[PDB]
Scaffold this active site. Sequence first.
Site, PDB file in Angstrom:
ATOM      1  CB  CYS A  61      -1.028   0.051   1.133  1.00 25.96           C
ATOM      2  SG  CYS A  61      -2.539  -0.938   0.934  1.00 25.96           S
TER       3      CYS A  61
ATOM      4  CG  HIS B  74      -2.795   4.851   5.166  1.00 25.81           C
ATOM      5  ND1 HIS B  74      -2.368   4.496   3.906  1.00 25.81           N
ATOM      6  CD2 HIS B  74      -3.244   3.715   5.745  1.00 25.81           C
ATOM      7  CE1 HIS B  74      -2.559   3.203   3.729  1.00 25.81           C
ATOM      8  NE2 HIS B  74      -3.089   2.705   4.831  1.00 25.81           N
TER       9      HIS B  74
ATOM     10  CG  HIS C 215      -6.942   1.056   0.031  1.00 26.79           C
ATOM     11  ND1 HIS C 215      -6.521   1.647   1.199  1.00 26.79           N
ATOM     12  CD2 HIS C 215      -5.905   0.307  -0.405  1.00 26.79           C
ATOM     13  CE1 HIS C 215      -5.294   1.248   1.474  1.00 26.79           C
ATOM     14  NE2 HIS C 215      -4.896   0.437   0.514  1.00 26.79           N
TER      15      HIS C 215
ATOM     16  CB  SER D 255      37.908  24.891 -56.223  1.00 27.53           C
ATOM     17  OG  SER D 255      38.804  25.892 -56.666  1.00 27.53           O
TER      18      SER D 255
END
Lengths: 1016, 923
Positions: free
Chosen positions: A267, A403, A443, A740
């Site tokens: 997680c 969280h 979640h 040249s």
Amino acid sequence: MTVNEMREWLRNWVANATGQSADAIDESTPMVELGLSSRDAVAMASDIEDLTGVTLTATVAFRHPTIESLATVIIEGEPEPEPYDEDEDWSRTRDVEDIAIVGVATRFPGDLNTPDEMWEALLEGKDCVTDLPEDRWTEFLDEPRIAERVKKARTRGGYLTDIKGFDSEFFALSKMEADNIDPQQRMALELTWEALEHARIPASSLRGESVGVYIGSSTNDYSFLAMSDPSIAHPYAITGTASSIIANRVSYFYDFRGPSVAVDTACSSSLVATHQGVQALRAGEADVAIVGGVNALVTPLVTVGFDEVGGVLAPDGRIKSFSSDADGYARSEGGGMLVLKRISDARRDGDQILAVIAGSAVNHDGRSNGLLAPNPDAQAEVLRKAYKDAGINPRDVDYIEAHGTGTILGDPIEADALGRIVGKGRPADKPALLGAVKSNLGHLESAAGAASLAKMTLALANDKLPPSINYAGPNPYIDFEKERLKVNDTVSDWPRYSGKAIAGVSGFGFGGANAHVVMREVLAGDLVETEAAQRLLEQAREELEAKEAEEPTKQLVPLAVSAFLTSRKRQAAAELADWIDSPEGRASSLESIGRSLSRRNHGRSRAVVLAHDHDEAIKGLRALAEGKQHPSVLSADGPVTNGPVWVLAGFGAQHRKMGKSLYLRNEVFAEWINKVDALIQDERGYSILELILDDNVDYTDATCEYPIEVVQLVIFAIQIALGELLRHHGAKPAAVVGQSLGEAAASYFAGGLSLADATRTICSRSHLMGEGEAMLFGEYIRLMALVEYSADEIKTVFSDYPDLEVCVYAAPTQTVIGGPPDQVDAIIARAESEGKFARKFQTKGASHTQQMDPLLGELAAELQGIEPKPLTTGYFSTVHEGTFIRPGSAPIHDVDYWKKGLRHSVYFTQGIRNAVDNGHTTFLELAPNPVALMQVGLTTASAGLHDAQLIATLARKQDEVESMISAMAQLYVHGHDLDFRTLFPRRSKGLAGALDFANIPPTRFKRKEHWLPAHF
Amino acid sequence: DWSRTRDVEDIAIVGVATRFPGDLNTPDEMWEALLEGKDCVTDLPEDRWTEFLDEPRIAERVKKARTRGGYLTDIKGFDSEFFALSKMEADNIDPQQRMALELTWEALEHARIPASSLRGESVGVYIGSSTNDYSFLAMSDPSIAHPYAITGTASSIIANRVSYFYDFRGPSVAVDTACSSSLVATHQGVQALRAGEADVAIVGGVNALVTPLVTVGFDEVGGVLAPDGRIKSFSSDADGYARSEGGGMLVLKRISDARRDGDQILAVIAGSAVNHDGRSNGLLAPNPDAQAEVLRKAYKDAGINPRDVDYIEAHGTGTILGDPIEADALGRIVGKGRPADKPALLGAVKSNLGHLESAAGAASLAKMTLALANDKLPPSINYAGPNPYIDFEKERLKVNDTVSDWPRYSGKAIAGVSGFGFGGANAHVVMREVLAGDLVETEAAQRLLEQAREELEAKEAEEPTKQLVPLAVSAFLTSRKRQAAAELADWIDSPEGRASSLESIGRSLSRRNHGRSRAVVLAHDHDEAIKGLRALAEGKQHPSVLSADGPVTNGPVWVLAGFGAQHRKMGKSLYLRNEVFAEWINKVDALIQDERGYSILELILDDNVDYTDATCEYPIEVVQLVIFAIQIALGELLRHHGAKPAAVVGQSLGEAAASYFAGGLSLADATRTICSRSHLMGEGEAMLFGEYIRLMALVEYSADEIKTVFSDYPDLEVCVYAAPTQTVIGGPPDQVDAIIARAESEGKFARKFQTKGASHTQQMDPLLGELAAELQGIEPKPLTTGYFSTVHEGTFIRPGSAPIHDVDYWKKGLRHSVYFTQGIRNAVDNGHTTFLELAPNPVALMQVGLTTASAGLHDAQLIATLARKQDEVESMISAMAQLYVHGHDLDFRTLFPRRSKLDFANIPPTRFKRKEHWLPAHF
């Protein structure tokens, strides 16, 4: 009644409520765990009051679940406020650099497929959780046992709308291979493309570079589908469903050569992946980092398992983070990704910095009360480690992206840790604001960190704080006032407690792995750190300011369109034309449209539309959308095999005002003219810049003291400047050839001679021809002419005239010859006898003839001191019979080389043909006027090449700035090295810059359904 | 220039664990097999994959596959009880997780780091694993599958469960690159250690062949698996490879930390790198350009010129097209510039074990660690001859097909280890051997000290003293502890045990895990050890064995008494035979010399000082100072070994030492309190004569019972509340000579002291003024440990409270009574059960015993430190052993300090009781 006198009745009553002995109870365990319910708690509420008087609140009767702590908290009463060290040093101990976030990509529930869509949804407080789609998991709902077990599960969550879709053609995959690829790998590929597009970094520019890829994921769920028939399963499933390939396939497709790793903490995987990316960038070891995580719910196995555990999943499927009605969570699928760079690199490359990562940390719980139990002590430690790494005092944090899983026992633990570190020392009027994107999306297991980081990046960039939803009221077991926290349930401004916005992002694995990332907003400090020639220059600028005020010049903007297939390139053009015609396109400057296109991927099939205003762009893009060739459109179905050949000719390419316009309207071109002017002044003592800026200099003896000499020097100067202007834009020759007089410039661009030493060769060669011409008169003169004879055919015609000699092998049927006028006036008739072509030049320099014999001695003297060097690019020397010289060979540009070239013939046609045999097809002419491209065209046709690329740079009667843009556009269309982004230099800082870029349509994909047919 | 651009530190390897095919379960077994050139590939065991061979379709498809490889012998076994797992939980755990747990234990045991010492520490865990094959077994019935399978078969839990069980608080990550996973995991471990962020790192990888799905798939591809199952690395007959299962693990530390901690360094990791192929010719096609780049990056990180490498442990998979690519890259970087007579030796452990997919890196690192430690190069097997498509001479490579010595082209051994994923992830690790440079960086008192040492050298030459060695045995269960003792006794009795010094046996045990159930055997020679271990193996209590079934709840209480604990030669022996104890006596002696002007060390070392007025100028004064000095030294000797008090209590003179150990006063300021208190009682006694004297006595009365007996005698006052039924009282002799009879009337106990200091009496009233003057300037500090103050009525003072040791505190204590019994009982109520007595002689432990019994505690731990008529070194070892047995803080490793740069014995390893755990599945 002291602590122990209160400690036994608790042991008594808990025994009274559980039928155990007087002292059998243990004081080192929560009372609820002893078979005690909360129903007796309210019954105990009075008991303590009547017995003592102190009232237990939910929070206090929760943070002290033990008996011994309970006994003391009643007697004494929360007497342990630990002191705060108000003077702790939170500065960095290691000298490390901050990390910049420059790109974001999103696949999140609710059809949030762009950062803008995600930001709108967040401000609205959108709830993206929904019921299970009818078309998902049908491989399993055909068996009654699993069907009824699934129907009993929660099953609500955040689901994607099209999980079976995949542009296999875009990513070069066969049908059978694409059918066997886990959707996690598909998301990784698609998100990487989108993130680089959002960052305005062309994917093609990163091929071969040290780019790291760190992606988190935690379930190989597509593997189960492949086990439906343990025999019918195809070996492609091994690579299609392996976790390591999630990152390795991204590296393979994009050609990234940095570390490529798949992380698993379940997680906090996205946060841990972000940690490795940050650490990699700081330690060298990587220059760009791609970090993120993915998650897919392909089968119902994990969902049914979590439901079987019980008390994990919310019945209604809504995560009520930090709320009084929190009752679990719901699973979701998706992915997100960020592009990271060191802040100095982003500043140096002119990237828009969305946010800054200051530091991060990772740790583990240890032996917690169970494997799946979070440990507040470890959480406090990871917060402390992160803020020491970031060098930021936690007291200054404004917002915590938590969280926040919505569990009624886990949320208090998270809040406890936050109060220990982030809340200590704050006054009650300065609380850290708190929220969780899991309330919006559910979640996202291995993508939770990606979701949280994306939310906070957009919040810092857009300067607003979106609300956290599903918040009925504070959780009773959290004292938010004491902890100095506040849930942000409405759209709010950044408090900026320290004067700048600072946020923290947390993520906790169910196995105990914790991570924390500290972010802040980008600051303003992160974005810092001859005499007469003047007169002609002054008037030239003023003479131009008048010619532009009377009629301003419409700037030519090149518009680049590309794709991996020509079919897709046409479709992209058609969609771009519609957007330009749209009002949003009309309201955007054409330069901003070009700048945005210049930072898109430059694919295999390329096209450029040269436009002055919108209408010409639309009329050109429409033609390109079809196959209609159009003069304002450059196109090609694919790249060329070999690099370009730079042709340094220049004999006869002089005209009145050559080089003037570009000198005034291009600083890089002007800079290089000034450098060449200084060197020539040292060698000769006069400034050619005076000659260039003057409008009365026709490069003739009527208006020049040494026309034979100054013409060669000016043309030489322009060749150096043009070649260095092309190199400024990323162009580089694969081989070089001269004719040249460009042998001096050819030697420079090939790495044989330095610019100073090369300037000596031309300077010495020029004036020695100057006096050589004057010193002779009458019959000692030699003329030069062109004839329609071939090299082999000259071999049987000089018997007529022995004095004649060959000067330049121009083309297979054309040759420049010279000698006494009596043998050249007549041989023109000799050619006219057979109806052939002939012409007599009107310049008497007579180079590569016998006239140069007296000059050879002085040339050796004047050139003594030049330092030849090995060659860095191929070299088709016309002095050495047109043979090819490989790069890295021994130096060739010694005095003997220069003596030979000024005396003997020029093997131009032989050198060209040798290049064609080596496989070269693109020829670029650096000169004030294309005079040799017609000669190169003849040799290529004769060699069997009727589609050679012949690119001019400047031309008489044609604008010079436009001519160089057209030349560079052609090189780009055929795949040669050229940084198109250099054509659109940023003129603003980004504040005033915002409008530097236009909102052009994004790259479109043609998604097809790829899946595995499976049952049981 | 191949020098380091960043200032970084080298990494030390201190431990290795192995589960490899062929029953190679220890590093020693693995080393023996490698030297022998053992081939560990075998046919499929009859008992494997039987869940699938019950269906004809899969059965005939499996029988058609190669199926030879390196298999383990017992994959279903697991000590679930040891790892605290229920049967249903243990049945659902992937064998990969089982290997991780077991290998971590074994590696820490090999490193001689007690697992218990790392609990709560910042230890990182990085494990590489690439397949979740046990998950398929759980899908046999998509309904019968138990939710334990989610945690049992998740990849992340492979590392998280290790961190959980061992209480590691560092980063815990599972890595996946599929053949370079172990090397990549080693890379993160090295990078973590260098960047702080971790103090120890556990790195490795695991692989299990639980189902035939991957094997059958690779066989279906065709041309991947060798028909005979033998990997013929870099050989002319190379034709593919065979899969294998196993695991390996290493313990990593920063080299300075390993040096500082006295760890044996087996090898050193200098640097490492990781990169990716990019767009190769196919996803599964190796790219030599990328391989060359990773080699270059690794050797720039290590700061070593590749020309100096001696040995390359190659990927060496035995494919006839892949081996030339690996050799090409090696020649680009490692072979350039070498003369033809100095070729890099080449080999592959995959020739021995097969392709351990995610454990290949662990196998290779383990091989090379043992090679560097043991100073030999084992052969690479299955080598018929050079591969025709490799010009080994031009590439400056040579295959080592025999046992060889390290060439040491640079004077020291250097090796490289390579690992390439089939997806394109490459890694390279550079190793070298440990070098010798990695292991560096009063006048008259002397005379008594000189003679004392010489007087001892004679008493030892005549009869040397047998050293007492404490032997520590422990386990998580008492049943296992007894079994461990029985197995250890047999090994000591064995000739290998007899040939090992008893100190080396003790040192090895001191570095084993110190578990919940502990026991110590105090032995002088082998025979006493065996006779003690045998008794411990049974339940027979033995005087030479200290044991306890579990820890105590609360920490120890240090009791600083000391009144009456003086004897002739107290402190002498320990001073001569313990440097730490002697160091602290010297510090206290200096301070007392400043305050008083005489050295107590002279008093200690002298043998004619009976601490009496007959042989001391101020016996009342010097006795208190010497006893005070011993208390400080003993307490600081215990702290030297990791002991720390949970609370402190003093009795009338140890309040000075008690204040020091509790953090209230510094050692200097505490020395002033005792110095001032001592001499003021010195002159106070002399200045009075005759009837102004006050006596001290002991009576069998209780505190409450004194309350109704001082009506008889009003002058009498209570001095010390010794015990519930015993109290020290003092006053005029006429009221004390008689009250002894008053007690004898009821048949009670009484006694009259023979010291007239008369403290805590009215005699101290004239002295209180001077005490305030002399003590003006002391700085009280808050308390760091609990404090049961006997001055303040025996009440408890929590740690961290406001300072209490002000002059008023010292005035009170020298004037009023001592609430000793009340303070003790309060400690018992707080839950304390262990009481440690710091004194030259245990005089207060008998008093503490009475209070605890009265409080309802008949099993209190009462530990003495020194005692008259008992050896002092042995007494302190016994005291420390008792604290360890009951679970109190004590570093047992400190009792066996390393004396050399044979320190350790080869004691038996921890034994496991494996049980069969598996899932019943079909189809």
